[PDB]
Amino acid sequence: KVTKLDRDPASGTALQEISFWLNLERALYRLKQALETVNDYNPLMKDFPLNDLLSATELDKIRQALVAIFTHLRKIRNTKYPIQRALRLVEAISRDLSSQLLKVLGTRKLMHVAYEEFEKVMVACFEVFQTW
């Protein structure tokens, strides 16, 4: 039941997958193959930094959040995560990065501001895109 539970990575946000792979480990600590799978995958799941992205309001904060996330993606070498699953994770980061972007531009109200301020905020946003 608990040992047979699995989740499609193509759906949901990234935080849902982080919460799944953390609380599955915590419930398994409370069978052998599931244990070694989550023990293999737990170096990725620990201290994952996308709460910085979700808490970011300024574009430079977003940019340092994605470089923190991508530098956290270095640790594939010690785990045996599925590669298509990893692609669905980085697709999920793209998803809530987009969501935070429409949130930020909803605060910014680009059409109701002058040309110059719109220019600096969108070249900052395109710097974020280039960094991505």
Experimental technique used?
Answer: cryo-EM
User: For residue 110, which phi and psi values (nearest 5 degrees)?
Assistant: -60, -35
124 in Cβ contact with 59 (< 8 Å): yes
Report the C-alpha gap between 115 and 79 in whole angstroms: 48
In contact, 64 and 127? CB cutoff 8 Å:
no
Specified resolution (Å): 3.9
Burial class of residue 15, CB neighbours in 10 A (0-12, 13-18, 19+)? middle
Query: CB atoms < 10 A from the CB of 66, how many?
Result: 20
